[PDB]
Design a protein around this ligand. Structure first.
Ligand SMILES: CC(=O)N[C@H]1[C@H]([C@H](O)[C@H](O)CO)O[C@@](O[C@H]2[C@@H](O)[C@@H](CO)O[C@@H](O[C@H]3[C@H](O)[C@@H](O)[C@H](O)O[C@@H]3CO)[C@@H]2O)(C(=O)O)C[C@@H]1O
Ligand SMILES: [Cl-]
Ligand SMILES: [Cl-]
Ligand SMILES: [Cl-]
Ligand code: NA
Ligand code: NA
Ligand code: NA
Ligand code: NA
Ligand code: NA
Ligand code: NA
Ligand code: NA
Ligand code: NA
Ligand code: NA
Ligand code: NA
Lengths: 260, 259, 264, 257, 263
């Protein structure tokens, strides 16, 4: 692709605004946004997580206005934030008291907050904590796993092309690809780490690369991806479940002429 | 709305006030505190009492009347901080000794520090931890909740239009709206989180957007909103109460011509 | 007053001061410490002893005398432009051998830790205070200056509680904060870090300067050729072998550069 | 003498990944060390080879160039590959409390990377100068008690994989003129990993004179350590866990004399 | 009065390391203190010398200036930049010897707890002010400590002025840089308190600190001597018994200097 001029004038810009719901496992009709309680295998050989115990990547493919030496929509800016951060102040709903007569233990512990904006599906590389883990039917996971899959097995390449299917723990953005995506993520690990969730409508991320070029939307499609595992909820029994929240996206795009 | 020139010269005004916290105020001695926390045994039986629920604070401030092609007040800058941070050093008032012969456990745990400045009420989106929570009479809460309310139900839209009414835990700023408000908040979660509270009279936040335009005050009203849940106080017994503090606002406004 | 030009040439001066902490000093051996903390039996009966309450520190520093001759429509005032500051004696908190509480069997003593308040201000007049009470039913002791006529509203904001930091070892830290509605002629800075296990994090350097000018380029203007310096440096608590806990404070160094400013 | 940058055929890119070398104690445990044991005394400290993480290195031949031209490394993009794998708290872990999830990877971490025009230069520093390092490792020789603080005899090059233990070597700050290195040790028994990923961050490798590493013999050297913390199994036993590191380096031709 | 920089042997570099001085309680324990004992009463605090970490200092001779008689002006070496880091950070990964398990079957507790990381570069000795945790502490023979201590020594006794002019002598816990002096030194330090604080140690050869003041002048080396000072108490090592020893690491310094004419 030779990238040529940006179009200007009123008709040259469009906006996408939406939210992506979290896909934490949803183990019953009352527990949207939560995983199944987390149960521990007695060996690496016997690790066999149920589908409703595994958070997955969220993805949306957003059609843009049809454009067609062609024009492509170029993603320029992102505003994003996590929706519902104050819901984590519910310390009165079958939580585990943190001491005798105390309030319930807030959601805390391992978190993964991730978002991406691209002109095509996010490209994934598989990495397994334990290559002998048996992933469940209904999920898309690294196949033909070997012990090398615990560090780097280049066979595990996939596209984030289905919602509620790609387990978070199996897949990361492939840093060897993703030229046409901008991605951002943070894993904070530990059973007691505190969520720190900032909200504001005053913050913008610029999506242009060092050449001044943003993601270019192939086929006039914008891909948005997210994970917002906020931590674990500990109930009165001591059982723990992942808890996720939705993510808001607002993306500004402009028409860009290319030669491909 | 077409935004035209800033007036110069009579063209400026300042709003200064404090917003008191609304933590629940369970009796005549406990302004700034909630009721002590109790925990349901199931999600279906979660039924928090009104005095156990911190709520958003709001003040709707009349500005000097304009226009008897009009002028509007434009909010340009904010100074803000939390008032009374040192009160949290009281570790001697019938708290829970941290060990034998020790001082009382200080206020700590989950905090939410939030403020907004707008030219109209803050727009809210409801999100529920547990959609089966029964919110109490005298609060304004997400109605017709479903399990999807635990992640995003677009029916739950409201305005922060009443003080001591909108519980913190079931509402956030709506990021799909609020074009005419600037909002900022941080939730820090965990029972052992230490309050970290900074004070200074030297820090200013600019409220202009990327086009150089601040909130424009509809009807010559400025809306200030806040939450400052600092953490929980632990009583000798182990029972825990939310503790909040007031927030200072100083807003500088200027007259802007609009069509 | 209208602020006019800065004088150049005899036109600058420097104040260098240390302010000692006022933690309560319960006996002739315990400068820098409070009395050990005692907890009231009921919330209503909170009644801290004076020597248990850290107080704000203040010094008023006389500057070189200005306006010795009759002047017409204008005077000079010293304008505070820059500050260097840090906490003096941070390494003393490495004494983990002086009859503290072992962290575990055979271990070293638990270091000073827990709730801290580090605060400083520079002004051309006393720091203006607003009272806020944790518990409006607390009985504050003789020898302290505390919010009077307390009501339940005092727990969040009672505008009756206005004071000046105009006496050392008198205004309890827990009762008073800088009044954000006043202090036009002071620059203040503070951080409360709350929690019994909070670690002190104390930085020292002679390479860091804070500029005291406001957005109009004007620093504090020293009324009567006096500079007001205020501080609190509650570093945390020391835990004795018995488990009893005392606040521990440290001194604060101040270096302020001032220039002569003409005012109308 | 460093002269002008060539412009125009003047650039090349290296992209690769370095796998971690944590000890690999059996055919199922690539990326992990042996379980960590505690010798009774410094005198008895004799760590098993499989318990010792090592530095990773790759030597990458570049396009042949030859007053000569050298490849100059200008920019780096890097990140840790597989950070989400640490979400597996359901595999032979130790419950944090009754009915809880497994304790996640936590505790001491070392995240380190370097880009140079020659092998990374190492200085040995020993926690305990009496440690017996095992056959198959390359370690500080003729150790003395001064090796616990600084013994200038302990100089080496990071010139072999599965060989140089992390705990006894650091980048030599007295050398490495032709390398850029970056590392963070985060200690503590319970510290939580904090791992950021993004394809939007670039590190510039030029020094204060505008000169990057110059690749001797048209070879680029990449080195890494990514000990993420320890995995606690159901018994309470702990193993180091490491992850691979991605590198993308942009290079340009530079004339030198 | 500082005049122009001389250009053209107008620059020199100092590169060295300073070893830590933690107490070295026996022939095997260089870099460690004696294990910490606690006094039976506050008044009876009496630390042994080998329990007390001390400040490190080196005085480095520079190329001799002013060999010929000069009239009203001399040259001085001016320190302009510093590169520094802690040497041996990975040694703290030895959790496999002589330690106390973190939990049943776990690895040894790592070095953690109170740290002090400090460095200075000056054209003369670092100037110190004494502050005592406890004025009734008996400091041991072989150390240089605040003398004629009074209760005011617990907060600020201006008697307690010293120069960091001897290695293995000035206890860390007794002394800090004197902010009322040190015009001709640049100093930097951080105390991180608490028994469980985790070390966070960064290394890189890409970071430079500029030593120039707000007038563009660095430390000026009196008598062509450069003073480097350091403390790097990284935390405490815990033995199986529970006893705890301070552990320190060496510090690397690289300083660039230029010749500056002065009146
Ligand atoms: C900050 C504060 O007020 N702490 C109190 C709390 C709170 O007021 C309460 O948790 C807020 O919801 O209450 C503590 O318990 C007292 C509370 O239960 C009251 C209610 O009337 O009763 C007190 O005990 C009475 C007892 O009920 C009588 O039978 C007896 O004659 O007198 C007792 C003493 O008045 C409880 O102490 C609490 O720990 O939650 C006390 C805190 O200090
Ligand atoms: Cl479940
Ligand atoms: Cl009780
Ligand atoms: Cl093993
Ligand atoms: Na709540
Ligand atoms: Na695959
Ligand atoms: Na107090
Ligand atoms: Na609703
Ligand atoms: Na000491
Ligand atoms: Na009063
Ligand atoms: Na998982
Ligand atoms: Na050697
Ligand atoms: Na090791
Ligand atoms: Na002395």
């Amino acid at each position: 692709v030779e990238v040529l001029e940006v179009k200007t004038g009123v008709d040259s810009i469009t906006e996408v605004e939406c939210f992506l719901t979290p896909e934490m496992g949803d183990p019953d009709e009352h527990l949207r946004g939560f995983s199944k309680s987390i149960s521990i295998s007695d060996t690496f050989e016997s690790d066999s997580p149920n589908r409703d115990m595994l958070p997955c990547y969220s993805v949306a493919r957003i059609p843009l206005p049809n454009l067609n030496n062609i024009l492509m929509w170029e993603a320029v800016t992102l505003k994003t934030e996590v929706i519902g951060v104050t819901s984590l102040m519910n310390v009165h709903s079958n939580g585990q008291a943190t001491h005798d007569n105390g309030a319930g233990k807030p959601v805390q512990g391992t978190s993964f907050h991730f978002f991406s904006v691209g002109g095509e599906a996010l490209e994934l590389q598989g990495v397994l904590f334990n290559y002998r883990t048996k992933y469940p039917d209904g999920t898309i996971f690294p196949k033909n796993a070997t012990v090398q899959s615990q560090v780097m097995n280049t066979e595990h390449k996939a596209y984030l092309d289905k919602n509620k299917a790609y387990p978070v723990e199996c897949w990361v953005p492939d840093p060897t690809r993703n030229e046409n995506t901008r991605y951002f993520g943070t894993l904070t690990g530990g059973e007691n780490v505190p969520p720190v969730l900032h909200i504001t409508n005053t913050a913008t991320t610029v999506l242009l690369d060092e050449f001044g070029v943003g993601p270019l939307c192939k086929g006039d499609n914008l891909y948005l991806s997210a994970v917002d595992v906020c931590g674990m909820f500990t109930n009165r029994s001591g059982s723990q479940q992942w808890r996720g929240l939705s993510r808001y996206f607002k993306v500004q795009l402009r028409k860009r002429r290319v030669k491909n």
